[PDB]
Amino acid sequence: FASVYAWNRKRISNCVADYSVLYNSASFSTFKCYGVSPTKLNDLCFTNV
Amino acid sequence: SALGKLQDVVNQNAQALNTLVKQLSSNFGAISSVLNDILSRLDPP
16 A cells, blocks of 8 residues: 555546445445445546546 | 607516526526526435
């Protein structure tokens, strides 16, 4: 990974990303969503992540 | 070939309906002005 004082920054581009494989992976100890509740992510549409 | 007392009523009523239509694009302190963009990226609570 990358340090905390120089974090990384990847600019995800066009690509059918399934926010579901993340949300249900149960391997994450913390999964908070703020602007938008998690289940409505796998149906939205963004331009730059 | 005058009628301003009749044009005043037409103008006042159109000017009120326009304000009513245009207030549909204020947030009133919410995140979006459109209800579908609150419904799509938020959960009921």
